[PDB]
Symmetry: C3
Subunit: 139 residues, 3 copies
């Protein structure tokens, strides 16, 4: 597929608490990048930047522990929520806010996960975020 | 990929209650279509109609609120359930019946989501349904 | 895509209890294979064996009933967990441990689901496991 091979996947490998900057941006950070074909995933910002016009698939599963908060996690496209997922609060099991979607992106569009409500104190180990170009679009 | 570029994604953008017809069909309706490459998703019927033989990927996340019902949501292929997902009933958080699968479809096969058990009173805002042709098949 | 068309999907169609061997391996078994393009999914072992170097997408949803256990399900790559999902224990609804990810695999790498914690007594009907080659890689 040449320059139509674009894919990333990243995970949260520890239960370490959020940083001050993560608290300010509420952008969910993934420390371990498993795939980054095209180097279009910015691992410092946990943001995917589309290299070309196309249909992109995204999936995420944000895993939380008991921390007295319910959460809403949203896939953001240029600062606007496209889809959201939800998780509650209990002390029986880790639980996940999961969702996925296909979206059209232009070159330079940015996709990332934002904690719209709640916090991730206690860590978000086992959280995952991945995406790939399904096919490019011309015009 | 030419005529092998087929993709759709749709979401439920409001918490409005189901219509009379939705009550009769128990087919889950998505008011906002984000992607519809090939125009193979029938937005009036929330049904994907395969344009050609191939392997198709589908994912869904049906989000419910507290409404005194648990739900079973099934991906239907020509009126038969292929996969199902489940959600409970509580008043702490929105929660989702989520699943996904790859299936082979022939031209004219129809895929849609059906509420096999329960109801979506209180709305199903944030629900998502998407799919794409992974690759075509000949013969 | 020729030999770049690789895809599988399998489901658990009954609530039958795990076998002795399933108890010993804790590898989750799927009795009904819906898709197996390339015949790279070993249905006896519920293991996908990559035919070539590439980026592969995997998704799973393991559905449990009340059985006095919480579970952790992990996607294993050559015996090492890549991603995990979690489900609790209650008697209100079936519930699912769900996650998905993209990974790079070499020819001969093996991917399967393992019950890292808990059991699936009471069955795991409606569980699903699927995957496909997103694109091949050279070198
Ligand atoms: C990120 O936000 C968290 C939620 O607001 C912070 O935790 C809160 O910290 C308050 C004092 O900074 C404390 O009164 C709150 O009870 C506490 N809330 C929760 C739910 O834990 C977190 O700050 C961390 O904890 C405090 C005690 C300090 O030691 C910080 O250095 C910790 O990181 C925030 N983390 C930051 C700003 O780095
Ligand atoms: C779609 O099905 C719902 C579940 O059967 C309907 O709600 C039910 O409406 C009954 C009277 O129509 C009422 O006795 C039940 O308590 C109620 N059940 C629940 C769980 O809310 C729904 O009807 C809506 O509510 C009633 C009161 C009417 O105003 C309808 O016009 C409402 O839509 C059904 N909606 C339809 C048929 O449009
Ligand atoms: C697979 O593992 C299960 C969990 O260890 C077994 O169930 C357990 O069986 C014990 C006796 O074998 C019994 O004391 C435990 O209470 C029971 N635990 C649970 C949670 O059910 C299961 O064995 C099944 O049940 C027993 C009674 C025998 O009839 C086996 O033939 C059953 O399969 C294990 N299944 C195997 C080894 O095939």
């Amino acid at each position: 597929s040449g320059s139509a091979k674009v894919a990333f996947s990243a995970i949260r490998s520890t239960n370490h608490e959020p940083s001050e900057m993560s608290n300010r941006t509420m952008i969910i950070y993934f420390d371990q990048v498993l795939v980054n074909i095209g180097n279009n995933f910015d691992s410092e910002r946990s943001t995917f930047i589309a290299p070309r016009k196309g249909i992109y698939s995204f999936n995420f599963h944000v895993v939380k522990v008991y921390n007295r908060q319910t959460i809403q996690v949203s896939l953001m496209l240029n600062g606007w929520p496209v889809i959201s997922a939800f998780a509650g609060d209990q002390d029986v099991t880790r639980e996940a806010a999961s969702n996925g979607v296909l979206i059209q992106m232009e070159k330079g569009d940015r996709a990332y996960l934002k904690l719209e409500r709640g916090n991730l104190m206690g860590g978000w180990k086992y959280s995952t975020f991945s995406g790939f170009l399904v096919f490019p679009l011309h015009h």
